[PDB]
Amino acid sequence: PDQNPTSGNNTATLCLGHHAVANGTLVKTITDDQIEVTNATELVQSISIGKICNNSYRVLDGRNCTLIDAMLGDPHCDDFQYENWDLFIERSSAFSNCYPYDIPDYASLRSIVASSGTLEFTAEGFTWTGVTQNGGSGACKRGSADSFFSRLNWLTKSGNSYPILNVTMPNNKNFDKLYIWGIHHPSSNKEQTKLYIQESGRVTVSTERSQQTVIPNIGSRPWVRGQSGRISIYWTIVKPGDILMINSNGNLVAPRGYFKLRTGKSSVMRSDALIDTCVSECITPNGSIPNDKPFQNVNKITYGKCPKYIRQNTLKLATGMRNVPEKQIR
Amino acid sequence: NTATLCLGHHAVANGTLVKTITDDQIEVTNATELVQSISIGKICNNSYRVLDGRNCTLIDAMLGDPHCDDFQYENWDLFIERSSAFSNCYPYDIPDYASLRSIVASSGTLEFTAEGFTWTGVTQNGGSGACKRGSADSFFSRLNWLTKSGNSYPILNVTMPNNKNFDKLYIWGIHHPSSNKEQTKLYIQESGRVTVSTERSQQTVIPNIGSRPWVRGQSGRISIYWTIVKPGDILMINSNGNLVAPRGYFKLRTGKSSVMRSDALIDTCVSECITPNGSIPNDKPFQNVNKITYGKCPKYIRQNTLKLATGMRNVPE
Amino acid sequence: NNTATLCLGHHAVANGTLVKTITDDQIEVTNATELVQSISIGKICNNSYRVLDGRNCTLIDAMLGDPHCDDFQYENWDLFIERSSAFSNCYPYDIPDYASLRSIVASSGTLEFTAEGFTWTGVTQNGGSGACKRGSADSFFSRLNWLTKSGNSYPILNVTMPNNKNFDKLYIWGIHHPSSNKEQTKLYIQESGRVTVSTERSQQTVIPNIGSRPWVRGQSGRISIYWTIVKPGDILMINSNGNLVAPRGYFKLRTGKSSVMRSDALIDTCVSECITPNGSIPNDKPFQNVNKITYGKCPKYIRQNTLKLATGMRNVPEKQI
Amino acid sequence: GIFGAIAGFIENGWEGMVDGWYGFRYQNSEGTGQAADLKSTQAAIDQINGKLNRVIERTNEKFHQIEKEFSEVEGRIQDLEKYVEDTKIDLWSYNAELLVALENQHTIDLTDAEMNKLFEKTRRQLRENAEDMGGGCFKIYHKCDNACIGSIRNGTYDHYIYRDEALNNRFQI
Amino acid sequence: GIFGAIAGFIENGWEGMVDGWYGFRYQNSEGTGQAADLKSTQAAIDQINGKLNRVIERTNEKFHQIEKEFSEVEGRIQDLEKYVEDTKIDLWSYNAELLVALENQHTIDLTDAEMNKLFEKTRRQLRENAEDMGGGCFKIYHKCDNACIGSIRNGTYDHYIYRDEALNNRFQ
Amino acid sequence: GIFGAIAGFIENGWEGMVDGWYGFRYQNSEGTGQAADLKSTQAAIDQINGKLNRVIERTNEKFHQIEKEFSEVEGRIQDLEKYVEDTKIDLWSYNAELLVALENQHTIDLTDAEMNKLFEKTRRQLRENAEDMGGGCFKIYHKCDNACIGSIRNGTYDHYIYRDEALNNRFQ
Ligand SMILES: *[C@@H]1O[C@H](CO)[C@@H](O[C@@H]2O[C@H](CO)[C@@H](O[C@@H]3O[C@H](CO[C@H]4O[C@H](CO)[C@@H](O)[C@H](O)[C@@H]4O)[C@@H](O)[C@H](O)[C@@H]3O)[C@H](O)[C@H]2NC(C)=O)[C@H](O)[C@H]1NC(C)=O
Ligand SMILES: *[C@@H]1O[C@H](CO)[C@@H](O[C@@H]2O[C@H](CO)[C@@H](O[C@@H]3O[C@H](CO[C@H]4O[C@H](CO)[C@@H](O)[C@H](O)[C@@H]4O)[C@@H](O)[C@H](O)[C@@H]3O)[C@H](O)[C@H]2NC(C)=O)[C@H](O)[C@H]1NC(C)=O
Ligand SMILES: *[C@@H]1O[C@H](CO)[C@@H](O[C@@H]2O[C@H](CO)[C@@H](O[C@@H]3O[C@H](CO[C@H]4O[C@H](CO)[C@@H](O)[C@H](O)[C@@H]4O)[C@@H](O)[C@H](O)[C@@H]3O)[C@H](O)[C@H]2NC(C)=O)[C@H](O)[C@H]1NC(C)=O
Ligand SMILES: CC(=O)N[C@@H]1[C@@H](O)[C@H](O[C@@H]2O[C@H](CO)[C@H](O)[C@H](O[C@]3(C(=O)O)C[C@H](O)[C@@H](NC(C)=O)[C@H]([C@H](O)[C@H](O)CO)O3)[C@H]2O)[C@@H](COS(=O)(=O)O)O[C@H]1O
Ligand SMILES: CC(=O)N[C@@H]1[C@@H](O)[C@H](O[C@@H]2O[C@H](CO)[C@H](O)[C@H](O[C@]3(C(=O)O)C[C@H](O)[C@@H](NC(C)=O)[C@H]([C@H](O)[C@H](O)CO)O3)[C@H]2O)[C@@H](COS(=O)(=O)O)O[C@H]1O
Ligand SMILES: CC(=O)N[C@@H]1[C@@H](O)[C@H](O[C@@H]2O[C@H](CO)[C@H](O)[C@H](O[C@]3(C(=O)O)C[C@H](O)[C@@H](NC(C)=O)[C@H]([C@H](O)[C@H](O)CO)O3)[C@H]2O)[C@@H](COS(=O)(=O)O)O[C@H]1O
Ligand SMILES: *[C@@H]1O[C@H](CO)[C@@H](OC2O[C@H](CO)[C@@H](O)[C@H](O)[C@H]2NC(C)=O)[C@H](O)[C@H]1NC(C)=O
Ligand SMILES: *[C@@H]1O[C@H](CO)[C@@H](O[C@@H]2O[C@H](CO)[C@@H](O)[C@H](O)[C@H]2NC(C)=O)[C@H](O)[C@H]1NC(C)=O
Ligand SMILES: *[C@@H]1O[C@H](CO)[C@@H](O[C@@H]2O[C@H](CO)[C@@H](O)[C@H](O)[C@H]2NC(C)=O)[C@H](O)[C@H]1NC(C)=O
Ligand SMILES: *[C@@H]1O[C@H](CO)[C@@H](O[C@@H]2O[C@H](CO)[C@@H](O)[C@H](O)[C@H]2NC(C)=O)[C@H](O)[C@H]1NC(C)=O
Ligand SMILES: *[C@@H]1O[C@H](CO)[C@@H](O[C@@H]2O[C@H](CO)[C@@H](O)[C@H](O)[C@H]2NC(C)=O)[C@H](O)[C@H]1NC(C)=O
Ligand SMILES: *[C@H]1O[C@H](CO)[C@@H](O[C@@H]2O[C@H](CO)[C@@H](O)[C@H](O)[C@H]2NC(C)=O)[C@H](O)[C@H]1NC(C)=O
Ligand SMILES: *[C@H]1O[C@H](CO)[C@@H](O[C@@H]2O[C@H](CO)[C@@H](O)[C@H](O)[C@H]2NC(C)=O)[C@H](O)[C@H]1NC(C)=O
Ligand SMILES: *[C@@H]1O[C@H](COC2O[C@@H](C)[C@@H](O)[C@@H](O)[C@@H]2O)[C@@H](O)[C@H](O)[C@H]1NC(C)=O
Ligand SMILES: *[C@@H]1O[C@H](CO)[C@@H](O)[C@H](O)[C@H]1NC(C)=O
Ligand SMILES: *[C@@H]1O[C@H](CO)[C@@H](O)[C@H](O)[C@H]1NC(C)=O
Ligand SMILES: *[C@@H]1O[C@H](CO)[C@@H](O)[C@H](O)[C@H]1NC(C)=O
């Protein structure tokens, strides 16, 4: 009869065919914007773990401190005194709490110190004859007493004298010394002559290769932590065999020593993400991401072993044939 | 009792050649050009807002060169600077001119707002025969040239807080006299100074006495500077001489506007892509007209022609 | 028999070569061709392009006129070679934005110099130094003129030089920074120096910087070099009342395809259209792995050291042997 | 073409087929005839239209950028501003050169494909009632009028109807 | 598909086939049955795994780079930093979009190819003992129980055993 | 490759065949022989040479650029310089990796295709006088001597001469 499951005794039917699924997934091709296959895999990473994992690279939480403030030695950043990192994290809630300053080419110094990956500092016996040392301010309280940046030495008149300061300090080491120094811009002529005797200061930090000369700039600025004066930070890099020399007849904010510069693979990143015990070879401001996929849509800013940032949030790679379902109606 | 059934494909009299992976030239039934190589010849104005600078550079229009007064509160998607543009006010330079030009161009607006700066002990609104506004001596409309009142020029100490929620652009400068006699005549003090500062940043400038080349009667010069003051912050200006004071602030937008150099005519038409040569259509993926572009533009490439096949291999009799 | 068997097939080789594909990391084909240049000749070939050996000189010292660099007085080049062994043996100096000036001259590819008769009345000229010995005489950079006080005083200098040409002039000038105020007064009278090089488009004021520095060839003083480009119609002007190291003239600025390169490789005769610091390379392959720094008609630098392009079919050898 | 139908075992194209890309020509007891196959034509066109839609009018929106022509000679950072733009243009020029080459090699192979598909489809319907003469032509071994031919073009040709007649003509002589 | 097998002369796929990607369905004197082909299935999966290996877990290490977000407005140099990053991102976005387009077109084509290869392989085994019905189906013109079908699936089917019987049912 | 002829239904290549890329082997009444097919061979080579033209001696001329090695640390504008060059190199590295990949995949698929084309061209000539044995081999069902084989190789084999002989051998 018609439900006979066999063939007609002298023949047989053999059919060749392929599998299919009830729920395919759409992928893009050269000819088709959307064409359905049996399945696919996502090539774009668009989800973050939500936090910065810290077991892979050494991540250092700056907390209330920028990398520059930690370097200069802002009292409340004294816990970052001799530290190092693969990645330094700067928070949006960070703040400065010492004497108000500006750094010409702030971004470059930040980069230089960040790539080096270390704040290891070494003091040096700079002989400052004829001047008062360790100047302090109420805008920079270490404890309840007036103080200053810990890596800087605010020099002022000793009695009736502020001589032409003439100091050397050679680099007999096998690495580049980074020296941080500055100049004080006072608020008024009366204050300039009071602190430095001379009417118009000067600062000349130099080596055999390079030199920088800076002149103070009298005039009141906005009040910041009770102070109308300002300080400008500059840097000088001294190579092995070379020799630092500092000359000044006024307004010098001198260095106490050098920072050790390394050729490094370290960096700095701005993020408010929690840092936690987990493992991930790629960090973004949003948090860590896995790096199984070749691309990512989380953030163009990344550190580590990361997928490449693209605009697309999804790209599907077919891992199966065209899906041609059995039932037209389900 | 038999029949022949032949299968075949079509063909066209004269096809067109294309490049493949294996062929330099192979003939197909049809193809379509993928490089836009011709231009309309003029800039179309009914897509984006285009502004003809005419005889004025963006910077001059900002500063307020008398002959650029027409631009006072203007705004644009694209500002066109002409090669016949010129300056016709006090001679001036702007250290890092390109950056100020970029910043203003991107903001896309000269929306200026005067502010009551309190300049006491000086005479304001200085003028020059090199910057005539009508028959009278004048100066850049957005700049205020201060000189001594009576027999003195005090240490000016003026401030202006930013209570808005946008960044304020402040344009200022310093005057460089042509002699020591001129310095003391206008400003009393033998050495000038201008310190414009915020809580985060500062800029100090000393003038520099001595003559320069002759420009519209004057050997003196001014140098233009700017300060961007953020919301919550505060502008302070301290100076005991040579200040060319600001009159107010420009309003900075984070806009999608820009500036472009072109001598192309501007006319009624439609096209969402602008180049110095003129507007071009954007139907094709690439172009070879100019790397300088604004709007929805094809990507610039070196090749002037790339034929994409839209048909099969053409094989005639 | 009255039948026959007709078999088809393809050729094959004993040992083929492995290549990459979409679906296979390694798959054997009959033949392939290398698309990355890995090895170089070892010498810089000086036959396609004009290669000029700096030897002990840098492009910048040559431009200024360091006594030992007087060989390069009026010379041009496609590619200027700088050796790691080069030195400066004249007055100790620095240059703000050194790299830029080096790049501008290098690109121009020429040290063509036309002297001009600047008049410096009230001042003594052609100042020398023991750090910069020409022969055995206290001399100076050949293109710069060190001005000092004429016995009694040093007046406000004011000299002009208009551009009659149809091309840009490159003026090189500087300013001296003394080691003490007793010097500043001795040499230039005024306790405060100042230099103002202006044009009808632009201006630069530089102020000297008194104070001692480390001794370079006996000298505590220093010089800072500057430059001013001048355009057709535009008029150069130089105001100064001290410390001016004046220019003797201008360099012509050509817009050219020239450059500068750092290398310690031998320069020798050979055929090659592409130059690297390691030596010249052949440009038959599309890519190369020798050095990202290149000049001439060069393959594109990539990180891979080998990439085999298949020039034949899938090699399927017979296993019957 | 990778299947060797177009510019292969089919010797040339029919210029006089103006209402389709692929189709039939036949000779039988009613005369000669020609007809476009709309299905294999539409396949090729759709794919080619797909290529177009992913290449055509997919333009970027771009506003303020960097400067690219300069009055003055400036040195270091102008070097960089030119090197960047030059590096970009060279890269996009490569991409466009390659894209076209690839898409065109493919357009040729997929058009060649549709021709071969139509052939094999037709061969399957005819079964034991026809042999392949070459040149893309089938010899059909039975009377096959325009309706019979129409049924082949429709894909409703019932080979059992003619099988007896056809097997008799093939194994004759 | 370029061979017109999948979504072509084979009307549709089989949802009941969970043991493979390609296979057989048969009717014979014992009933109807289903069986996967592991060799063709494996060929397709291996090529697709090759693509995955080329693309999955392949990432460069990068460390300090440039800034890409800015607090203040600066002008020329910030423009350049932004343009550089914006240029790089556009080129990588294009690479990814094209990588996926080509690979998917190829994947679809190579699975269609393995379906066609399997048919052509089977056709060769049956030689003069079967005819193409269409729809990827063979009518076998001799009695072929489950052992007999299995020998075709194993590739040990000797067509000479049934040739005379088959020819006589094909033509008579 | 994608047609499954090479490394497919043809078991392996012939090292002995040195005068061409594709060809014929045969046994018959005059013993056995081998001969290369020139049209098919040339078609593959012409395609492959085509690719070489797109890649070999296609070089750009560049002059002054940017500095790519550095003595001192400078920070910002040096970070940008190194990042630009680094960005450029990875993109070209990718371009190179992908080119070689797509080309070699395509070189394998087009050389396989030509093998198949040659097979289908021979199949159409022989018409009903031969059957596909498998292994890329035909069983011709009549006394086909070297002159007869030559005609197949030359594309001038007239099947109507041998039909009634061969048709009789296949079915009896
Ligand atoms: C140049 O002009 C400047 C401003 O026009 C002058 O600076 C001003 O000097 C006064 C007097 O010394 C300062 O007064 C101080 O302000 C702090 C700020 O406190 C704020 O918060 C508390 C919260 O309770 C509130 O009480 C205040 O109203 C403020 O909102 C006060 O705590 C003290 O009164 C303190 O004395 C101004 O702060 C300061 N302003 C600025 C902008 O610098 C400057 O003296 C002039 N210079 C010269 C040379 O004449
Ligand atoms: C430092 O030296 C400079 C050069 O010696 C001095 O600059 C010159 O100063 C005098 C004033 O004492 C100016 O005299 C004026 O010259 C213009 C000429 O302008 C142009 O147009 C006219 C008309 O078409 C044409 O005749 C000329 O060729 C010019 O092209 C006259 O129009 C005025 O009436 C007046 O005579 C010089 O113009 C000026 N030259 C430059 C280049 O600046 C400077 O004064 C000296 N400083 C000191 C302190 O001594
Ligand atoms: C401010 O302090 C500066 C740093 O201390 C002073 O600079 C020093 O000045 C003295 C001379 O007053 C220089 O000494 C000279 O050195 C040279 C060369 O040194 C080598 O000499 C021989 C030969 O090779 C050998 O013994 C060693 O290799 C020496 O290194 C001698 O040839 C001279 O005779 C003389 O001794 C110092 O070199 C110099 N120091 C530096 C770091 O340059 C400066 O005098 C002070 N200035 C003011 C205005 O007060
Ligand atoms: C009139 C009134 O209501 N009150 C005044 C106070 O203004 C005055 O306080 C001092 O004001 C001076 C400026 O005139 C300084 O701001 C000073 O601040 C210090 C600081 O930073 O803490 C004091 C430090 O000892 C100084 N450190 C040094 C020299 O190393 C430091 C420094 O001079 C400046 O910051 C440089 O710009 O300033 C305020 O304490 C008060 C005391 O007067 S004074 O100290 O004798 O000048 O007098 C009231 O009448
Ligand atoms: C034959 C003869 O020499 N007669 C003299 C005139 O030279 C003298 O003209 C003035 O010369 C001075 C240079 O010392 C200026 O060029 C001045 O021009 C202005 C100008 O138009 O730009 C006049 C403006 O009123 C000034 N604006 C101010 C102060 O805000 C402006 C300014 O001082 C300079 O631009 C600053 O560099 O200069 C010529 O008018 C004429 C007038 O003498 S004076 O002005 O009372 O000193 O008197 C005969 O001496
Ligand atoms: C008293 C004592 O202990 N020693 C001095 C020696 O210093 C003096 O040698 C001179 O030292 C001075 C230091 O101020 C200079 O370095 C000078 O060198 C020259 C030079 O560079 O060759 C000499 C040039 O003629 C000067 N060039 C000029 C004026 O255009 C040049 C110039 O002043 C500086 O470069 C400016 O920075 O300095 C050494 O000659 C030694 C010789 O005596 S004398 O002073 O030269 O007449 O005797 C002592 O009294
Ligand atoms: C960051 O800065 C805070 C401000 O001084 C500091 O101290 C306090 O933290 C919270 C702020 O809401 C309060 O408990 C209180 O104001 C402060 N408490 C003190 C000083 O004892 C935070 O501790 C700082 N953060 C870190 C991680 O050190
Ligand atoms: C990585 O981050 C974790 C989480 O902050 C650090 O571990 C914490 O250390 C503090 C004391 O410093 C403890 O009070 C917490 O209990 C610790 N973990 C957690 C999850 O609460 C860890 O020290 C960081 N650094 C490294 C190198 O692992
Ligand atoms: C569009 O304008 C640009 C810029 O002016 C043209 O580039 C010039 O082309 C001419 C003609 O070959 C050259 O002589 C100049 O050297 C080029 N000038 C500059 C400044 O680069 C470009 O050819 C124009 N393109 C068009 C009309 O399609
Ligand atoms: C390329 O530079 C080389 C390096 O010196 C030149 O080779 C020698 O040049 C010297 C100086 O004239 C001759 O005395 C030698 O005989 C040269 N050859 C050798 C092997 O030392 C060479 O002449 C330069 N060629 C060109 C075309 O500039
Ligand atoms: C070409 O020369 C460069 C130097 O310009 C060589 O670069 C060095 O490569 C080695 C590889 O072992 C590295 O370890 C060094 O750090 C590199 N040094 C510098 C300064 O870049 C390069 O190896 C040479 N390449 C060749 C001959 O192919
Ligand atoms: C097809 O691809 C999907 C999605 O990529 C595969 O799902 C993964 O399968 C592995 C192995 O079982 C799991 O470990 C992963 O967790 C899966 N990933 C995701 C995102 O779901 C799936 O295995 C493949 N096959 C089928 C039949 O779907
Ligand atoms: C294929 O392999 C090699 C190397 O790829 C080839 O050897 C050369 O032949 C080419 C012909 O184009 C010439 O350019 C050179 O003379 C040879 N060496 C090269 C390019 O390195 C040859 O074409 C083939 N096989 C051989 C020789 O066994
Ligand atoms: C192939 O088939 C022969 C027929 O018997 C079967 O046995 C099992 C393996 C089933 O899966 C089907 O193949 C048939 O019903 C076997 O006798 C023979 O051993 C098999 N050979 C191989 C190599 O698998
Ligand atoms: C062929 O291409 C042209 C030009 O791109 C286009 O107008 C149209 O699509 C086609 N026209 C004809 C006649 O085929
Ligand atoms: C196809 O054509 C034949 C004869 O012309 C006819 O019998 C049949 O109904 C047609 N079928 C369709 C679907 O058009
Ligand atoms: C090819 O083959 C035949 C038979 O070997 C030979 O006689 C003839 O000369 C050849 N002709 C052509 C056209 O190739």
Coordinates of N, CA and C in Angstrom, one line a residue, chain C residues 2-12 20-21 49 102-103 257 259 262 283-284 292 294 296-298 300 302-304 308 310-311 313 316 318-319, chain F residues 12-15 17 20-21 23-27 57 59-65 67-68 86 89-90 93 97 100 104-105 111 115 136-138 140 142-143:
Chain C
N2 N 41.2 -5.6 -27.7 CA 40.5 -4.6 -28.5 C 39.6 -3.7 -27.5
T3 N 40.3 -3.2 -26.4 CA 39.8 -2.1 -25.7 C 41.1 -1.3 -25.3
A4 N 41.0 -0.2 -24.6 CA 42.1 0.6 -24.2 C 41.8 1.5 -23.0
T5 N 42.7 1.8 -22.1 CA 42.5 2.6 -21.0 C 43.3 3.9 -21.2
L6 N 42.5 5.1 -21.1 CA 43.1 6.4 -21.2 C 43.1 7.1 -19.9
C7 N 44.2 7.3 -19.3 CA 44.3 7.9 -17.9 C 44.8 9.4 -18.0
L8 N 44.3 10.2 -17.1 CA 44.7 11.6 -17.0 C 45.5 11.8 -15.7
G9 N 46.2 13.0 -15.7 CA 47.0 13.3 -14.6 C 47.7 14.6 -14.7
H10 N 48.6 14.9 -13.8 CA 49.4 16.2 -13.7 C 50.8 15.8 -13.3
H11 N 51.7 16.8 -13.5 CA 53.1 16.5 -13.2 C 53.3 16.6 -11.7
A12 N 54.6 16.3 -11.2 CA 55.0 16.5 -9.8 C 56.5 16.5 -9.7
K20 N 51.9 29.1 2.6 CA 50.6 29.4 3.4 C 49.4 29.6 2.5
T21 N 48.3 29.2 3.0 CA 47.0 29.5 2.3 C 45.9 29.9 3.3
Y49 N 71.9 57.1 -7.4 CA 71.8 58.4 -6.7 C 73.2 58.9 -6.3
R102 N 68.2 70.7 10.1 CA 68.8 69.5 9.5 C 67.9 69.0 8.3
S103 N 66.6 68.8 8.6 CA 65.7 68.3 7.7 C 65.4 69.3 6.5
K257 N 64.1 66.4 -4.1 CA 63.9 65.0 -3.7 C 65.1 64.5 -2.9
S259 N 67.7 64.0 0.6 CA 67.5 63.7 2.0 C 68.9 63.5 2.7
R262 N 71.6 58.2 8.3 CA 72.7 57.8 9.2 C 73.1 56.4 8.9
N283 N 65.4 45.7 -5.7 CA 64.0 46.1 -5.6 C 63.1 45.3 -6.6
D284 N 63.5 44.0 -6.8 CA 62.6 43.1 -7.6 C 61.5 42.5 -6.8
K292 N 63.4 49.6 8.1 CA 62.4 50.6 7.8 C 62.9 51.9 7.3
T294 N 64.7 53.9 4.7 CA 65.1 53.7 3.3 C 65.0 55.0 2.5
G296 N 65.0 56.0 -1.9 CA 65.0 55.5 -3.3 C 63.8 54.7 -3.6
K297 N 63.9 53.9 -4.7 CA 62.9 53.0 -5.2 C 62.9 51.7 -4.4
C298 N 62.2 51.6 -3.3 CA 62.3 50.6 -2.3 C 61.1 49.7 -2.1
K300 N 58.5 47.7 0.3 CA 57.9 48.1 1.6 C 58.4 47.3 2.7
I302 N 58.3 45.2 6.0 CA 57.4 44.5 6.8 C 58.1 43.7 7.9
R303 N 57.4 43.1 8.9 CA 57.9 42.4 10.0 C 58.3 41.0 9.7
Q304 N 57.6 40.4 8.7 CA 58.0 39.0 8.2 C 59.3 39.0 7.6
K308 N 56.4 33.1 0.8 CA 56.5 32.3 -0.4 C 55.2 32.4 -1.2
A310 N 53.2 31.0 -4.3 CA 53.1 29.8 -5.1 C 53.1 30.1 -6.6
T311 N 54.0 29.4 -7.3 CA 54.1 29.5 -8.8 C 53.7 28.2 -9.5
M313 N 51.3 24.1 -9.0 CA 50.2 23.4 -8.4 C 50.5 22.7 -7.1
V316 N 51.7 16.6 -5.4 CA 51.3 15.3 -4.9 C 52.3 14.2 -5.5
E318 N 54.4 10.7 -6.2 CA 54.0 9.3 -6.2 C 54.8 8.5 -5.1
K319 N 54.0 7.7 -4.4 CA 54.6 7.0 -3.2 C 55.0 5.6 -3.5
Chain F
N12 N 47.6 10.7 -7.4 CA 48.8 11.5 -7.3 C 49.3 12.0 -8.7
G13 N 50.3 12.8 -8.7 CA 50.9 13.4 -9.9 C 52.0 12.4 -10.5
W14 N 52.5 12.8 -11.6 CA 53.5 12.0 -12.4 C 54.8 12.7 -12.5
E15 N 55.7 12.3 -11.6 CA 57.1 12.8 -11.7 C 57.7 12.6 -13.0
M17 N 56.4 12.7 -16.0 CA 56.0 13.7 -16.9 C 56.8 15.0 -16.7
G20 N 55.5 18.7 -19.6 CA 54.3 19.6 -19.4 C 53.7 19.5 -18.0
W21 N 52.6 20.2 -17.7 CA 52.0 20.2 -16.4 C 50.8 19.3 -16.3
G23 N 48.6 16.0 -18.7 CA 48.7 15.1 -19.9 C 48.0 13.8 -19.8
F24 N 48.4 12.9 -20.7 CA 47.8 11.6 -20.8 C 48.8 10.4 -20.7
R25 N 48.3 9.3 -20.1 CA 49.0 8.0 -20.1 C 48.0 7.0 -20.6
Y26 N 48.5 6.0 -21.3 CA 47.6 5.0 -21.9 C 48.2 3.7 -22.2
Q27 N 47.4 2.6 -22.2 CA 47.8 1.4 -22.8 C 46.8 0.9 -23.9
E57 N 58.6 43.6 -9.4 CA 59.0 44.9 -9.9 C 57.9 46.0 -9.8
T59 N 57.3 48.7 -7.4 CA 58.0 49.3 -6.3 C 57.7 50.8 -6.4
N60 N 57.6 51.4 -5.2 CA 57.4 52.9 -5.1 C 58.7 53.6 -4.8
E61 N 58.8 54.9 -5.3 CA 59.9 55.7 -5.1 C 59.6 56.7 -4.0
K62 N 60.4 56.7 -3.0 CA 60.3 57.6 -1.8 C 61.6 58.3 -1.5
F63 N 61.5 59.5 -1.0 CA 62.7 60.4 -0.8 C 62.8 60.8 0.7
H64 N 62.7 62.1 1.0 CA 62.8 62.5 2.4 C 61.5 62.1 3.1
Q65 N 61.7 61.6 4.4 CA 60.5 61.1 5.1 C 60.6 61.6 6.5
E67 N 62.3 60.8 10.6 CA 63.3 60.0 11.4 C 62.6 58.9 12.1
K68 N 63.3 57.7 12.1 CA 62.8 56.5 12.7 C 63.6 55.8 13.7
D86 N 55.1 52.8 13.2 CA 54.7 51.5 13.7 C 53.3 51.1 13.1
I89 N 53.8 50.0 9.4 CA 54.4 48.7 9.2 C 53.5 47.5 9.5
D90 N 52.6 47.6 10.5 CA 51.7 46.5 10.8 C 50.7 46.4 9.7
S93 N 52.4 44.8 6.8 CA 52.7 43.4 7.1 C 51.4 42.6 6.9
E97 N 50.8 39.4 4.3 CA 50.3 38.1 4.8 C 49.1 37.7 4.1
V100 N 49.6 36.9 0.0 CA 50.2 35.6 -0.2 C 49.2 34.5 0.1
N104 N 47.8 32.1 -3.0 CA 48.2 30.7 -3.0 C 47.0 29.8 -2.9
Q105 N 46.0 30.2 -2.2 CA 44.7 29.5 -2.2 C 44.1 29.5 -3.6
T111 N 44.7 25.7 -10.7 CA 45.5 24.6 -11.3 C 44.7 23.3 -11.2
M115 N 43.0 20.9 -14.5 CA 43.0 19.4 -14.5 C 41.6 18.9 -14.8
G136 N 40.8 9.2 -12.4 CA 41.1 10.0 -13.6 C 41.3 9.2 -14.8
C137 N 40.8 8.0 -14.8 CA 41.0 7.1 -16.0 C 39.7 6.7 -16.7
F138 N 39.8 6.6 -18.0 CA 38.7 6.2 -18.9 C 39.0 4.7 -19.3
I140 N 38.1 3.0 -22.6 CA 37.6 3.1 -23.9 C 37.3 1.6 -24.3
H142 N 37.0 0.0 -27.3 CA 37.4 -0.4 -28.6 C 38.9 -0.3 -28.9
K143 N 39.3 -1.0 -30.0 CA 40.7 -1.1 -30.3 C 41.1 0.3 -30.7

